[PDB]
Amino acid sequence: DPDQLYTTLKNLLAQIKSHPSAWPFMEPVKKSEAPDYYEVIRFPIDLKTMTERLRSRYYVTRKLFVADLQRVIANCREYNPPDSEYCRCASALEKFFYFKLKEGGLIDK
Numbered sequence: 001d002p003d004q005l006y007t008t009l010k011n012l013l014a015q016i017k018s019h020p021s022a023w024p025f026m027e028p029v030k031k032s033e034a035p036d037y038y039e040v041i042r043f044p045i046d047l048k049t050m051t052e053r054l055r056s057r058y059y060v061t062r063k064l065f066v067a068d069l070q071r072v073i074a075n076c077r078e079y080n081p082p083d084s085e086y087c088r089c090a091s092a093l094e095k096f097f098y099f100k101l102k103e104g105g106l107i108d109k
């Protein structure tokens with residue numbers, strides 16, 4: 001059901017982008033912030049790119065969406081110190097989006 005999938009993902013992403021811990025991940029990492037980021041992290045992803053992918057019908061499966069979302073967090077944990085503000089935000093956002101994924105029946109409760 002592509003129409004159910006699209007609206008469900010749109011509604012989920014709107015909530016994720018509204019969370020206070022989403023701020024580090026709203027737009028792509030800039031080279032000024034981390035000059036080697038795009039050599040280290042080979043599949044960079046952020047919530048603006050995910051919005052763009054959603055709206056162009058890239059997410060033809062739930063799993064494609066969940067893979068990008070989980071990679072926002074995984075990239076952050078690979079690049080940044082494990083005890084850092086970005087990693088704290090990643091963990092907070094992760095906790096929230098798993099609650100929402102469960103609420104939406106998009107993973108097992």
Ligand SMILES: CN1C[C@H](Nc2cnn(C)c(=O)c2Br)C[C@H](c2ccccc2)C1
Nearest residue numbers: 023024025027028029030033034076086
């Ligand atoms: C585009 N850029 C991404 C930053 N997030 C970053 C930066 N560098 N690295 C290495 C990261 O992992 C993340 Br997440 C957060 C920043 C910002 C966002 C809001 C307010 C102040 C700063 C806006």
